[PDB]
Amino acid sequence: GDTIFGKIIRKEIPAKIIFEDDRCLAFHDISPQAPTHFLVIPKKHISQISVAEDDDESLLGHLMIVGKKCAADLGLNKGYRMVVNEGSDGGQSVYHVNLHVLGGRQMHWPPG
Amino acid sequence: RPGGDTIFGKIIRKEIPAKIIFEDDRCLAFHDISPQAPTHFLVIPKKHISQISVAEDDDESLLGHLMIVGKKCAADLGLNKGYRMVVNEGSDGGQSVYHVNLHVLGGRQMHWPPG
Numbered sequence A: 001g002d003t004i005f006g007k008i009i010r011k012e013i014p015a016k017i018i019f020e021d022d023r024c025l026a027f028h029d030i031s032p033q034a035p036t037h038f039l040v041i042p043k044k045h046i047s048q049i050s051v052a053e054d055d056d057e058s059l060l061g062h063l064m065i066v067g068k069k070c071a072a073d074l075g076l077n078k079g080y081r082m083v084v085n086e087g088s089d090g091g092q093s094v095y096h097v098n099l100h101v102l103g104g105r106q107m108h109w110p111p112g
Numbered sequence B: 001r002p003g004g005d006t007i008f009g010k011i012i013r014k015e016i017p018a019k020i021i022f023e024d025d026r027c028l029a030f031h032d033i034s035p036q037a038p039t040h041f042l043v044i045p046k047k048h049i050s051q052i053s054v055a056e057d058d059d060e061s062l063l064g065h066l067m068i069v070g071k072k073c074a075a076d077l078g079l080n081k082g083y084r085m086v087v088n089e090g091s092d093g094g095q096s097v098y099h100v101n102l103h104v105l106g107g108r109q110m111h112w113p114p115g
């Protein structure tokens, strides 16, 4: 079913958009866990990484390339952490695939 | 040398031991020596890329392949309740081996924030 991230893609509710193309959208997370914390999501509604199809491989990599380019544009020259959550144990909060990018502070270990 | 001389390049060339889960022409999945969850493994490209910040545009398929392999390995390992994937960049990310590596962690509740 639809999620709040679908509404964001459709521009029905506001978000602070960082980057957009024909197949993905990057925007700041509304509940930031670091001084910079944004999401990169595909426009295709893949609900979770566990159901991603083989044909989605380059799209998923595109999310990471967009994410790293956005991180550089946002000044994260000391580094950052990328996260994808799956399911209950993964703490996934929205059932639309989303790549978190967090930086601007030391990220710790374990990663949750 | 194919893979470079980080410890992950050594693992790729079978020069240092690893507990391998899956291997193909593009990548390798193997268990982390310092697990942070009951299941904790890594998926790495066989092509040496030092860190995500220097990945090239044409690396998209390879990077996505790491995630597809990661999720397939997670299912094969019975992580039916979910898992977390992590890629660390640089000092603030906590990167400690400069060869791109995707962590897959599961078998317990992961917490927020992710470090």
Ligand SMILES: Nc1ncnc2c1ncn2[C@@H]1O[C@H](COP(=O)(O)NCCc2c[nH]c3ccccc23)[C@@H](O)[C@H]1O
Binding pocket: A107, A108, A109, B007, B018, B031, B032, B033, B034, B035, B087, B088, B093, B094, B095, B096, B097, B098, B101
């Ligand atoms: N022979 C070997 N066989 C198998 N695994 C090995 C290994 N040799 C090292 N490994 C693992 O390779 C991973 C590298 O992951 P990152 O570069 O993302 N650093 C994250 C940790 C961190 C190190 N310092 C930090 C500081 C802050 C946050 C996180 C960290 C670690 O989990 C190691 O256990």
Ligand SMILES: [Cl-]
Binding pocket: A085, A091, A092, A093, A094, A098
């Ligand atoms: Cl999530």
